[PDB]
Design a protein around this ligand. Structure first.
Ligand SMILES: NC(=O)c1ccc[n+]([C@@H]2O[C@H](COP(=O)([O-])OP(=O)(O)OC[C@H]3O[C@@H](n4cnc5c(N)ncnc54)[C@H](OP(=O)(O)O)[C@@H]3O)[C@@H](O)[C@H]2O)c1
Ligand SMILES: NC(=O)c1ccc[n+]([C@@H]2O[C@H](COP(=O)([O-])OP(=O)(O)OC[C@H]3O[C@@H](n4cnc5c(N)ncnc54)[C@H](OP(=O)(O)O)[C@@H]3O)[C@@H](O)[C@H]2O)c1
Ligand SMILES: NC(=O)c1ccc[n+]([C@@H]2O[C@H](COP(=O)([O-])OP(=O)(O)OC[C@H]3O[C@@H](n4cnc5c(N)ncnc54)[C@H](OP(=O)(O)O)[C@@H]3O)[C@@H](O)[C@H]2O)c1
Ligand SMILES: NC(=O)c1ccc[n+]([C@@H]2O[C@H](COP(=O)([O-])OP(=O)(O)OC[C@H]3O[C@@H](n4cnc5c(N)ncnc54)[C@H](OP(=O)(O)O)[C@@H]3O)[C@@H](O)[C@H]2O)c1
Ligand SMILES: [Mg+2]
Ligand SMILES: [Mg+2]
Lengths: 250, 250, 250, 250
């Protein structure tokens, strides 16, 4: 239906937000390849959504540049030319800037920043000039808009994704590539990332944090991603789509 | 049926953006009342979308405070409790701040700002605490994000709507009203507002203005409004949804 | 003397932030006219900063359009051509959008928005093309950047000032008028406005409001205005200068 | 005068913007250490401003992590505890995201992002809790606010610096460290970086780029840095100070 004919790569599509994006993309008629590092999780995730006629898992670390090439090749062979890239894989580290080790800094940036760069660069290269209505959806966060004292490297990575995506959006638009680039900025969402940080859900559910008084769910981010992947959003590029319970409005 | 059961007021819904919002709202299952000041244009507009079982026209100037209560009463008599208010009526004045007459200032603000205040205030009063999944969508502009040297009063109006809507969203969220408030920021859209302005489409299509090299169409704004009116966006409030061909990304 | 030769109008210059702006403007060599509604308060304020050779009080309500041209005339007759206009007069209303009466809406906007419009429009007309290094400083707020659930009309006015100022800045720059226009966005500041609201300073001093754990002082806003009025800022126009204890960074 | 008793490190302080920051810092009474990679240029730069009692050059690549500790030790041995860190060193690469090689990407980020991280992290460690009125000034750019189609890696780096600085600002504020962190966002400035790229100043001077119709000068950025280093800005933290001729206001 709303994504008829689309062919999407969703990185980190085996749990949490990415899993829900994959789920709703398939529901709307897209063919999907989901990636993650853990093949046990990934093969189960794909089967939980559908058969191999509509979704497949590829084991791939988003920080692995060479694997990105193989990932597009595998997706093309399975489903035809890629039309949609969701750079969603990402990790956190609970450290202030002051307390961030250089190893933590480089590791987080290798996934959250390099991975989004590799996927955006290759997405442009693979999808430009093909009349596909192509769309690159880069997962930022409210932490790409406001700071947090205890996620210094994470803040750096999400602010970089925010503005790098604008550069790509502009170049694709000016060159008539038929590729749009936008960023999505979730507020707190119930995912393993949040579930595995003790007390995170309670802290983020305070009204001083999220005015709605609760955190979101992965489908809240899947539905804005369906909009940005569909041709309904053919005039949206370089823009920031914030789904955050009011977090950044105060 | 993405808007199953919704009951919407769309101000200025007889031409341009508002007409397309009303069109796509009816397509997705909403009952709609459109407003405008010209009864013959408006009755035809309504009938062009559907019968009185799904859409009706009400003559009402958005700057008319007393008429806002009658407009809600009329819509609820027709279709039941209002769930969705799109404050779309608006006008432009091609004057710099320096050259703006006080008459022009007050006239434009009485529509673009007073009207949005009236609809937002009454929408909250009439829709809160009824479990309706209510949504107030306030039409700002890229001109609520950046300035334009020849639309001073318009800039003032669109920046007011931008931040006033955040106040409403926060209060509704904190009080558990089940009412969301967001703003939409179109870039240039082919409408009578633009068509009646000699040279405007040619000017806005320059790559230094809109990187996509063309202006949008009314459905481009309709589809983001369908997203915001639907329960798909139940975690989006107090946020800005920009559909502008890249205008504000550079 | 960083404001050597400057001649400044500071509306609402008899108490609080405006008083300190006037005070530091005189310390830096400017001649200053302060305005306010109450003559006993205003004559005492002017005298508390200096003599009539450097500062004078003029009774003028910023919402009074007719009084604006007389205010420029009086200042120029006293001190020579006006070079600097600080649109600082403003009022607050502690009401949600839902709870705002139309009288309260119109009244607040008549001061906070009309007054800034009147001073900016006249300031451009009377200062352009005279080699004065002219500067218009419009007092917005953090409430021009984020919403507050019980400051609806105030939010509307401060967002309007934010974007209307950009329009003016751009027109002046493109026409080589030698007039810059910028906005200042104070966070909470200890002033009679804040002193009169019982509990406001305690509430705004919580870390979830102001991360520094205390509110600012009027000189905090005076010093950014000195920078903006001086030729040090000859390349700054259309920009937002935020002095807020970290309030909007989280 | 305005920087009495301050002790500043200015990275990349031997040319362009950084040289002028150093020049005005010394004029206002600060002791300054400027860094650069080229020793002959650097010693001449320092001598051009003053003697070793007020300014000294230290050869240091901002991307060199271990050298940062030596740089702080050298500065403190010369002038006493560092109070002020200006992370100004930075490089550009004229490539779209699509055309950026991974080595170009890594190289630019090692200076523009890692260097700002290293200086901010160590600055907090070395200046907190000492009553210095410490200030960390991180040089972003208008390219941290909007995208540029031919500056992909640069855009990423400047957006990272923008939001990473908010994290640090908040942490320092919440912990009462007496350390402030802010970002400066120059528009086009006549410097060797701009001079050495053929067609830079001509293109940036077009009204569609810079509404003032000309680019800035290094002193334009020096003076906002003076304000941010001084105690005049003791209530400013986590904020963005834009000096860009109106570039981002349209
Ligand atoms: N949850 C929130 O509140 C929130 C809010 C705003 C933004 N975000 C952003 O949304 C995205 C998804 O977050 P989430 O909360 O859904 O995370 P999550 O629950 O931890 O899920 C992460 C997914 O990414 C995969 N993954 C982890 N590291 C990877 C790597 N190097 N390469 C490829 N895949 C990898 C995981 O699979 P494997 O473990 O098998 O690799 C898993 O499929 C992230 O970019 C995050 O920054 C989240
Ligand atoms: N077109 C663009 O490029 C653009 C871009 C950004 C934002 N916007 C915003 O989008 C909204 C719609 O713009 P548009 O371009 O579709 O305008 P448009 O083509 O002029 O259509 C205006 C609609 O509003 C109605 N209307 C005008 N004044 C009214 C009033 N006082 N009370 C009630 N209805 C009124 C008109 O009908 P009657 O004349 O019969 O009353 C018509 O139905 C406006 O808020 C505008 O500021 C437009
Ligand atoms: N204090 C804060 O926390 C804060 C934060 C951000 C922004 N602001 C803004 O900064 C500005 C100054 O606020 P403040 O806190 O210093 O206020 P304040 O202490 O109440 O002082 C207001 C000044 O304005 C004058 N005034 C009031 N209404 C006026 C009118 N209609 N025409 C001319 N003068 C008028 C008052 O004199 P009379 O009463 O004698 O007329 C007084 O001199 C306002 O724009 C406010 O919105 C304040
Ligand atoms: N110029 C503009 O239009 C503009 C606009 C906005 C922002 N900015 C930003 O402002 C900052 C200064 O730019 P600019 O135009 O003054 O640059 P510039 O004219 O090229 O000067 C750069 C200075 O940094 C030094 N430098 C270069 N690489 C370095 C490294 N790895 N470690 C330490 N020092 C290094 C240079 O000396 P050596 O070569 O000897 O090391 C020189 O002293 C940069 O962060 C830039 O991104 C510039
Ligand atoms: Mg906030
Ligand atoms: Mg722009």
């Amino acid at each position: 239906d709303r994504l008829k004919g689309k062919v999407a790569i969703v990185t980190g599509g085996t749990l949490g937000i990415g899993l829900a994006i994959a789920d709703k993309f398939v529901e709307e008629g897209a063919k999907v390849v989901i990636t993650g590092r853990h093949a046990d999780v990934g093969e189960k995730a794909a089967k939980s959504i559908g058969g191999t006629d509509v979704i497949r898992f590829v084991q791939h670390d988003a920080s692995d540049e060479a694997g990105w090439t193989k990932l597009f090749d595998t997706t093309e062979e399975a489903f035809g030319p890629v039309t949609t890239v969701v750079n969603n894989a990402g990790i956190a580290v609970s450290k202030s800037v002051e307390d961030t080790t250089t190893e933590e800094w480089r590791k987080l940036l290798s996934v959250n920043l390099d991975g989004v760069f590799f996927g955006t660069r290759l997405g442009i290269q693979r999808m430009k000039n093909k009349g596909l209505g192509a769309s690159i959806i880069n997962m930022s966060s409210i932490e790409g808009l406001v700071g947090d004292p205890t996620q210094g490297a994470y803040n750096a990575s999400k602010g970089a994704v925010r503005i790098m995506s604008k550069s790509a959006a502009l170049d694709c638009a000016l060159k008539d590539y038929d590729v749009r680039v936008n960023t999505v900025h979730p507020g707190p969402i119930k995912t393993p990332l949040v579930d595995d940080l003790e007390g995170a859900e309670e802290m983020m559910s305070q009204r001083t944090k999220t005015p709605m008084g609760h955190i979101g769910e992965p489908n809240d981010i899947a539905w804005i991603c369906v909009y940005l992947a569909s041709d309904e959003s053919k005039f949206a590029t370089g823009a920031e789509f914030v789904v955050d319970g009011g977090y950044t409005a105060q």
